[PDB]
Amino acid sequence: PITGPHIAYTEAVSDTQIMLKWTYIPSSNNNTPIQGFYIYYRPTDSDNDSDYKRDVVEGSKQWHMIGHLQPETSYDIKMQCFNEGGESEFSNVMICETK
Amino acid sequence: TPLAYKQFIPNVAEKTLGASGRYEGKITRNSERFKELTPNYNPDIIFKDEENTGADRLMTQRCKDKLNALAISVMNQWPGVKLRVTEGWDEDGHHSEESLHYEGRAVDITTSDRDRSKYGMLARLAVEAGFDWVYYESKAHIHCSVKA
Ligand SMILES: [Ca+2]
Ligand SMILES: [Ca+2]
Ligand SMILES: [Zn+2]
């Protein structure tokens, strides 16, 4: 894939969880099969691009709940879609605090 | 005196005439107003740039002026510590509708050491640097804005 997803919104649902919802239009990559999405998150206090943790989600989903986060902590959040060939560009990068 | 969490100075709403004044509309990358924005390349300011686009550097002339003054006072206050910008002008879209971040008129800031015990004083230093509104917006950063 050469088009990445776009993050529509991020919202904390608890002290340890953040909901994110994205859009991805299959035809933007000629309808190439996408196997899933990678969702990246790291504490906003880090500017180390190596400090992103990753969740893997299936290709049908347009939202995800990130969990096991720290209370009252800001996170940088971005994502890619992927397939057997490889990965997209990163999305926009949202900042979102847990409760 | 230092600000505490949730406090703002002047103690009126951001978009009031006495503070930063009204929203004028989101400035997008492809727009004519985007040309009023130029990158702040001050070597005494750290720009987070999690976007890998240089967006956080982009801001109005007035925002630059006050930010640059603050960069000096920060280094004076705590030797070895610098001003850090987490958000300048934004296109990622996580800010509220009518956020001054969408116009290059607001910055979220920390100290370089992320020592939250310094943030209340950092907010005071931003007021003294001449930001039109300064808000201890989050436990994690101070929000500073300027008039159009
Ligand atoms: Ca940023
Ligand atoms: Ca941004
Ligand atoms: Zn802000």
- The enclosing H or E element of B138 equals strand B133-138
CA geometry: angle B105, B68, B81, nearest 5 deg = 115
**Extents of the domains making up chain A:** 1-99
Closest chain A CA to residue B140: A74
Please count the structural domains in chain B.
Answer: 1
Neighbouring residues of B101: CB distance < 8 A, sequence distance ≥ 6: B87, B88, B89, B90, B95, B108
Contacts B91 to A, Cβ<8 Å: 92
Contacts A78 to B, Cβ<8 Å: 50
Which pair of structure tokens corresponds to residue A53?
């943790």
* Cis amide linkage into residue B10, ω under 30° from 0: yes
CB atoms within 10 A of CB B36: 15
Q: How far is the CA of B99 from the centre of ligand 3 (A)?
A: 8
**Cβ-contact A70, A40 below 8 angstroms:** no
Check CB contact under 8 Å for B86 and A7: no
Q: Provide the shortest C-alpha distance from residue A49 to chain B (in Å).
A: 8
Q: How far is the CA of B88 from the centre of ligand 2 (A)?
A: 7
The CATH number of the domain holding residue B44 is 3.30.1380.10
The CATH architecture to which A1-99 belongs is Sandwich (2.60)
| Closest-approaching ligand to the CA atom of B85 | 1
Strand ranges of the sheet holding A53-58, from the earlier edge strand across to the other edge: A53-58, A36-43, A74-82, A94-97
- Residue numbers of the domain that contains B33: 1-148
Closest chain B CA to residue A73: B140
Experimental method: X-ray
Closest CA to B108 of B138, B148, B129: B138
Closest CA to B39 of B54, B28, B52: B54
Spatial distance between the Cα atoms of B45 and B115, rounded to a whole number of angstroms: 16
Q: How far is the CA of A49 from the centre of ligand 2 (A)?
A: 15
Phi, psi of B121 (to 5 degrees): -75, -35
Spatial distance between the Cα atoms of A92 and A79, rounded to a whole number of angstroms: 8
